Amino acid sequence: HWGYGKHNGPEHWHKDFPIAKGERQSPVDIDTHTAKYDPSLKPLSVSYDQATSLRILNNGHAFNVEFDDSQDKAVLKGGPLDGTYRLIQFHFHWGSLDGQGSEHTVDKKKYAAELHLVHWNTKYGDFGKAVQQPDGLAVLGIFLKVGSAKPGLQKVVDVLDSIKTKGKSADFTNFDPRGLLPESLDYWTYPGSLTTPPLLECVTWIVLKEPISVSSEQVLKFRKLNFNGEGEPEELMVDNWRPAQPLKNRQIKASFK
Numbered sequence: 001h002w003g004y005g006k007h008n009g010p011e012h013w014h015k016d017f018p019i020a021k022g023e024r025q026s027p028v029d030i031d032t033h034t035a036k037y038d039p040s041l042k043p044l045s046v047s048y049d050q051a052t053s054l055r056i057l058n059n060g061h062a063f064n065v066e067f068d069d070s071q072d073k074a075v076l077k078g079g080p081l082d083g084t085y086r087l088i089q090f091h092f093h094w095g096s097l098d099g100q101g102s103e104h105t106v107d108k109k110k111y112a113a114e115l116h117l118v119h120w121n122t123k124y125g126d127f128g129k130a131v132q133q134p135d136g137l138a139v140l141g142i143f144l145k146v147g148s149a150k151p152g153l154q155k156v157v158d159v160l161d162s163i164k165t166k167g168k169s170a171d172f173t174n175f176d177p178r179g180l181l182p183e184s185l186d187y188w189t190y191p192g193s194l195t196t197p198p199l200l201e202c203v204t205w206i207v208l209k210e211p212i213s214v215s216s217e218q219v220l221k222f223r224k225l226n227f228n229g230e231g232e233p234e235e236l237m238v239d240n241w242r243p244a245q246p247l248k249n250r251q252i253k254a255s256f257k
């Protein structure tokens with residue numbers, strides 16, 4: 001089954017998931033000079049004050065911090081979006097080295113990691129229905145660079161020892177995802193896909209221009225996770241990113257100039 005190794009990695013995914021070669025695949029390179037400022041883009045509204053985190057799970061591909069999405073508690077609205085999108089989970093992709101790890105790139109620059117806050121359009125009733133719709137999901141992407149520590153990330157880092165291997169979960173209540181945001185909400189946006197199988201073409205991508213900084217020690221702790229289950233051969237969970245895909249017939253729009 002699929003993963004990020006030599007024999008089951010991104011170059012292989014198209015055999016089980018032909019949409020891998022589709023018309024609106026993610027991630028992409030964001031060519032800053034070619035992106036178009038769109039004055040018609042409304043400001044992003046990130047309303048996370050009532051967020052209810054529940055649990056953190058190592059799923060064998062990344063780790064997800066999951067939220068109660070049975071009411072409008074943590075929502076994303078505005079920007080390119082019509083309607084209300086509920087936060088269901090966030091996770092990251094990261095590298096084995098500080099010079100790689102992000103899925104989106106900016107003028108071909110790779111960041112050390114990339115945070116994805118995954119939201120679904122409430123008009124579709126549940127997440128499983130939403131991923132079957134071209135406007136079903138909105139994922140807020142945030143680049144990580146290595147420098148100073150991100151204080152709001154530390155509670156995540158310190159629970160990772162309890163979910164080292166695939167299938168492990170731990171209680172993770174009262175986490176505030178506002179502590180993971182940069183100062184600016186300036187963004188690029190384009191229509192795309194899930195960046196792992198099943199690669200469904202259901203995402204409005206909103207990628208923030210301003211990265212957050214995390215410390216060497218913080219990212220080193222991500223790299224101690226395992227892709228494998230307990231009692232299976234140890235393979236470090238690193239380089240769990242898909243490279244940039246062809247932009248095809250898409251325009252990336254910018255909220256700023």
Ligand SMILES: NS(=O)(=O)c1ccc(NC(=O)NC2CCCC2)cc1
Nearest residue numbers: 116118131139193194195196197198
């Ligand atoms: N990296 S990402 O595009 O933000 C992403 C988000 C969610 C999932 N997967 C997920 O939500 N899977 C369920 C929906 C379809 C099958 C199960 C994969 C990639």
Ligand SMILES: [Zn+2]
Nearest residue numbers: 092093116195
């Ligand atoms: Zn992701």
